[PDB]
Structure 1
Amino acid sequence: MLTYGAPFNFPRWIDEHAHLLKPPVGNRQVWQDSDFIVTVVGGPNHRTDYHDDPLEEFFYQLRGNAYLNLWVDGRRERADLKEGDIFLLPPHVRHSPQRPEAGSACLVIERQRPAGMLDGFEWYCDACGHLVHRVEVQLKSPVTDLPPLFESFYASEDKRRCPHCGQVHPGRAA
């Protein structure tokens, strides 16, 4: 069977889900229960967490512009996703997507992580660059499981306290 339905027009689908491609929802997964996790991500959205994905992530910035804050070679770096750009992110490269533009739309493709293969979410100290806090999660339902993880970081000065220099991470906003 065509478990995931027939082909359909993607620009019209994006237009039809505009109300979800902005705060507070931000993103919408295209198909459910599939191995390929296919998501369209809108904006605006900024975030301070870095994702440590044990598998690859594919990006195609269909509308508008965004960028990824990265750690590369032990250094803070930025990869621009200009409108029309595609990009393949290797496993475990720490990344923090920033999406300043309303009306933007990025196709993201990931694969389901098998049982035992954990994702990491972590925060870094703006003063000295040391890792402040990391949580590992079996990421089955990100839409609903990530918000409480992030909220528990924002809520705890202990979690936000840099172990190296003592500076308390600002939490939700840079």
Structure 2
Amino acid sequence: MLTYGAPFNFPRWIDEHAHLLKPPVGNRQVWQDSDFIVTVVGGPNHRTDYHDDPLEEFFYQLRGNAYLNLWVDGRRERADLKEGDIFLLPPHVRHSPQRPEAGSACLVIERQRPAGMLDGFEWYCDACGHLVHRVEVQLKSIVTDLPPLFESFYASEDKRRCPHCGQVHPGRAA
């Protein structure tokens, strides 16, 4: 059958679940236990981390504006998600989704990482730009399974310690 129910108006939906869009990831997955992972992220989000997805990621800023800090060749950068734009992120490209304006909604779509495929979550230093701390995982919930790490890094000086210059990363408040 139509496991994922039948079709439904997307805007309305966004309008109804406008209140479930909350930090630190601001997510909200549309259909559960699928392969295509259709989440809808709103603002304001608090990300100071860099996701290292091993798969592609697609976005279409349905309503609102936002950006993406990223590493081009090894140089800090920034992609701008101006309302109405779409964009496909190649694999492993490091992304730091910045969603500031409340009432924002972006369609983020990814896949289910196979068993054996891990996503990474890095943190870089402000002064020296060296990798400060990275973690690899067998992702199983881009909604209810991310914050738990953030929470154990923003809480550990040992980790937020730059292995190149020693400057400690701000953490849970950049």
TM-score, with structure 2 as normaliser: 0.97
- Post-superposition shift, 1:25? 6.9
- Post-superposition shift, 1:122? 0.8
Runs of 4+ in 1 over 4 A off after TM superposition: none
Change (3 A) 1:53 1:24: closer
Change (3 A) 1:24 1:50: closer
- Post-superposition shift, 1:172? 1.4
- Post-superposition shift, 1:33? 0.6
Higher strand share: 1
Q: Which residue of 2 aligns with 1:12?
A: 12
Query: Which consecutive residues of structure 2, in runs of 5 or more, have no partner in the other structure?
Result: none
- Post-superposition shift, 1:143? 2.3
Change (3 A) 1:114 1:24: closer
Q: State whether residues 27 and 39 of structure 2, in contact with CA within 8 Å, keep that contact through their aligned partners in structure 1.
A: yes
Residue by residue over 1:25-64, the C-alpha shift from the partner in whole angstroms, topping out at 9 and shown as x without a partner, is: 7221000010000001000113110000000000000111
TM-score, with structure 1 as normaliser: 0.97
Q: State whether residues 65 and 99 of structure 2, in contact with CA within 8 Å, keep that contact through their aligned partners in structure 1.
A: yes
Give RMSD over aligned pairs: 1.1
Structure 1 stretch displaced more, 79-88 or 139-148: 139-148
Q: State whether residues 24 and 147 of structure 2, in contact with CA within 8 Å, keep that contact through their aligned partners in structure 1.
A: no
Structure 1 stretch displaced more, 86-95 or 43-52: 43-52
Q: Percent identity?
A: 99
Change (3 A) 1:101 1:126: same
Q: Distance in 2 between matches of 1:37 and 1:24?
A: 19
Q: State whether residues 24 and 45 of structure 2, in contact with CA within 8 Å, keep that contact through their aligned partners in structure 1.
A: no
Q: Distance in 2 between matches of 1:25 and 1:94?
A: 16
Q: State whether residues 27 and 142 of structure 2, in contact with CA within 8 Å, keep that contact through their aligned partners in structure 1.
A: no
Q: State whether residues 47 and 173 of structure 1, in contact with CA within 8 Å, keep that contact through their aligned partners in structure 2.
A: no
Q: State whether residues 64 and 105 of structure 2, in contact with CA within 8 Å, keep that contact through their aligned partners in structure 1.
A: yes
- Post-superposition shift, 1:24? 6.4
- Post-superposition shift, 1:144? 2.5
Change (3 A) 1:148 1:81: same
Change (3 A) 1:24 1:89: closer
Q: Which residue of 2 aligns with 1:35?
A: 35
Q: State whether residues 22 and 102 of structure 1, in contact with CA within 8 Å, keep that contact through their aligned partners in structure 2.
A: no
